[PDB]
Point group: C3
C-alpha cells in the first residue's frame, strides 16, 4: 500500500535501529511490513536490542504475562500488529484520517476510515470495538443491492454511478463531507452511526450502548436509543461554550499534568477559564 499503517508509523519513530522480535505466529501482511528490518521469532528479548511485535491481542496478553516484558514500555518498545485502531501517545493517521492521542476504536471504525466515511477523529476519544459505521445504499432506484454493479458493463456503470453522485440523501456517502468525530467522545458497545446522514459528532459527545444515531450529535450531548435522541447534555451551556475554544485536549502532556485540578473538577474548570 501507499499509506503507512499504524504499526509502520510507530516503528518509524521508536524502533531506532533495533531488530523486531515477533511474539506470535505472523500473518502474510506482517511479513511484508517487517521485510526491510531484521526480525525473528521472539525468544530472549532485551529492549536495548529488540522491539517486540505481538501479532494479535491474545499474543500481547501472553507477552505481558511473561517476566521478560516488564522492561518494555507500551509503544516505545512493543506494539500489537493487528491493532490499527489502538490508542497511541502521539497523533497518528489511519487511511488518510488523522487520529488524536489516546484514541482507540474497533475494526468496524477502521474499515470506516478506509471507506472514506471519516474525516478526522479527535483526541482522548473512546470508541467501543463493537461500534459500526456504515453508509446507506441508494433508495431512489428499483434495487437496493450494491454488488449488483458487479454485472454492469461500462455503459451501465457510468449511468448507475451518475445518479449516485446526484443524490441529496448521500448513498455510499458519495455527496457529503466525511464525518468528523470530536475529542473527549465516548461511544458505547453495539452503537451505530449512519455515514450517509451523520456528518459531525461534536467534541465531548456521549453515545449510549445499542444507540443508533442518524443525525449530527451536538458537542457534549448524550444521545441514547433506537433511534438516538438527546436525553441530557453532559455539561452546562456556559461550559460547552468555554470548552469549545479552550481545547484542553490540545494541551501538552506537561500542561495536562499542570491543570489536573481543572480537568478533575468541572466546577473548578469554569473558575479558571470562564
Amino acid at each position: 500500500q501507499g499509506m503507512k499503517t499504524r504499526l509502520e508509523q510507530v516503528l518509524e519513530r521508536y524502533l531506532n535501529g533495533r531488530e523486531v522480535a515477533v511474539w506470535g505466529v505472523p500473518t502474510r501482511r506482517l511479513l511484508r511490513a517487517l521485510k526491510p528490518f531484521k526480525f525473528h521469532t521472539a525468544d530472549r528479548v532485551d529492549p536495548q536490542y529488540h522491539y517486540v511485535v505481538a501479532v494479535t491481542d491474545d499474543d500481547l496478553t501472553d507477552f505481558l504475562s511473561d517476566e521478560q516484558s516488564k522492561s518494555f514500555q507500551y509503544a516505545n518498545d512493543y506494539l500489537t500488529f493487528d491493532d490499527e485502531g489502538g490508542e497511541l501517545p502521539f497523533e497518528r493517521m489511519c487511511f488518510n484520517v488523522p487520529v488524536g492521542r489516546q484514541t482507540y476504536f474497533g475494526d468496524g471504525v477502521v474499515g470506516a476510515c478506509e471507506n472514506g466515511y471519516i474525516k478526522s477523529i479527535g483526541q482522548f476519544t473512546s470508541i467501543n470495538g463493537t461500534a459500526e459505521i456504515h453508509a446507506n445504499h441508494q433508495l431512489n432506484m428499483t434495487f437496493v443491492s450494491d454488488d449488483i454493479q458487479n454485472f454492469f458493463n461500462e455503459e451501465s456503470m457510468a449511468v448507475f454511478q451518475e445518479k449516485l453522485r446526484k443524490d441529496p440523501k448521500h448513498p455510499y456517502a458519495y455527496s457529503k463531507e466525511p464525518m468528523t468525530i470530536g475529542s473527549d467522545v465516548y461511544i458505547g458497545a453495539h452503537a451505530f452511526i449512519n455515514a450517509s446522514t451523520v456528518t459531525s459528532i461534536g467534541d465531548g459527545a456521549i453515545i449510549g450502548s445499542g444507540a443508533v444515531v442518524l443525525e449530527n450529535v451536538p458537542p457534549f450531548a448524550v444521545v441514547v436509543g433506537v433511534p438516538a435522541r438527546i436525553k441530557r447534555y453532559r455539561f452546562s451551556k456556559e461550559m460547552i461554550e468555554t470548552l469549545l475554544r479552550v481545547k484542553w485536549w490540545d494541551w501538552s502532556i506537561e500542561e495536562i499534568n499542570e491543570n489536573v485540578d481543572a480537568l478533575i473538577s468541572p466546577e473548578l474548570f469554569m473558575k479558571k477559564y470562564g
Copy 2:
C-alpha cells in the same frame, strides 16, 4: 463433510487444472480441502498456471495490494477461504441452503444456515456481517437452558425432545418451515431476526440497523426499531404487485444490462411493466 463448501464449489467450476497458490497461513480445514490438488505457498503467481486462495480477508487485502494480483479476476482466478458468506457471480449453496447471485452475509447467518434456520436466500441481497439469526429456547418448562440436555440419559432425552416438537411457539425452530430471505433485501448492522417466529422475509425488504424483527417482513417494507415496526414501504403498492412477478433479480447478466434504465429509474420501471 458431505456438503461442499463455498470454496469447493468455486474451485469445481473455475480452477480447471491449475494449482492453488495459498496467500496466507492455512488452517487445518483448508489443508483438508486442498488435499487432492497441487498447492504451495504463493510466491510468483500467474493466473494461467495458478489460482490464488487467500486464507483470511486480511490476507486478501495483502494480495490485492500486491502488483501480481491485477491479472486475477475475482472468482475465476482467486477467492477467500474464510468467506463462506461472500458474494459470488453464480448461484451457490451453503449448508443445503440456496444462495442467489451477488448475495453476501456474515458468520452469524452462515451458522444460521447450518442450524437449518434458513431455507433460501434471494439474489442481490445485502446482509451485514454483524447480523444474527437465532431461535428461541423452550419456554413451556421450568428451565430455559439448552445444554442442560448434555446430562439427560436416553429416557430423559426422549421426553424432553418430545414436547419440543409439540410446541406452537417453535423452540429451536423445531416445528416450523425454515425461514426464507427474499431478493434485493437489505439488512443493517447489529440487526437480529428470531428464527423461532420469523418464517419469511419478503423480497426487497429493508431491515434497519439495531433492528430486532420478531415477525414476518412483507415484501418491500422497511422495518425499524426494538422491536421492529413497519415505518414505511419502499415502493408504492402498484409497484410491489408488479415487482413480485416480473422478478428482475432472475434476469440474465445481459438482460440486466439491457434494462439498466428500468432498474435505475423506478418511475420508468412501472411504465415498462405496468
Copy 3:
C-alpha cells in the same frame, strides 16, 4: 499467569497421563500451556493414548468432521483452546469467577470476568457470544476518556483515582460489589449489561435480543428493549418463591434424571415442591 485457564482446568482433571494432539495451528499462548506435556501435531489419534486439543472453533468443526473423532467424548477426550467461555460438565473458574455447569458465554463476557466486573455465573446459564458487559466511565469530571491517564504522572494519577473510588455512580465498577449472574439465565444476541449500575441478575432471568439493561433484573423476569423494561415474568409468583430455594440447578446429574417430569412440566413442578 497465576490463575488457571479453562483449558488447564480441563486437562488437570481428564488428561491423565496422555499426550496432547493439537488439531490446528497453535498460538503462542497454547504452546506455553502445553509446555510441560508431550504434544504433537495430530495425525492418527486414539483416545486411549491421546487428547485432542483444537486451537480454534473452526479447527474443532474440522476435527468432528473427521472419522477419528467419534471415539472422543466432549471434555474427557477433547476441548477447544480458544474457548474460555465454553460450557463444561463440571463447575470451573474464569479469572477468579466461579462458572456453573453447562454455562457458556462469549469473548465479551470473558473479558468482563477478567476486568472484575462479574462475581459469579450460575449453572445452566445461556449467554450469547455477542453480548457485551462494560462499566461506565467517570462523569463527574471535565473529561470522559479513560486512557487520558496514560499521561498522568504519579501526583496526577493519585488524585484522579482518588475521586474514582469516591463516586456513587460507580465509574469503572470501582465502588460496587461485582455483578452476579444467576442460574437458568438466558441472554440474547446484541445484549448489553452496564457493569457500573447492574449488580445482580436474578436466577431464571431472560434478557431479550438487542436489550440494554441498566438496572438489576429480578429473578425469572423477562427484560426487553432499549433501555430494558420488564415486559413479563417467566413464571407465577408462587413458583418464583419456591424455585428460589429448591435450586434444581444444584441437583446432581442423577437427580436431574430422576425429576425429569418436574423440570419438564412447570405445572408438575409446583405439585411436587409447593
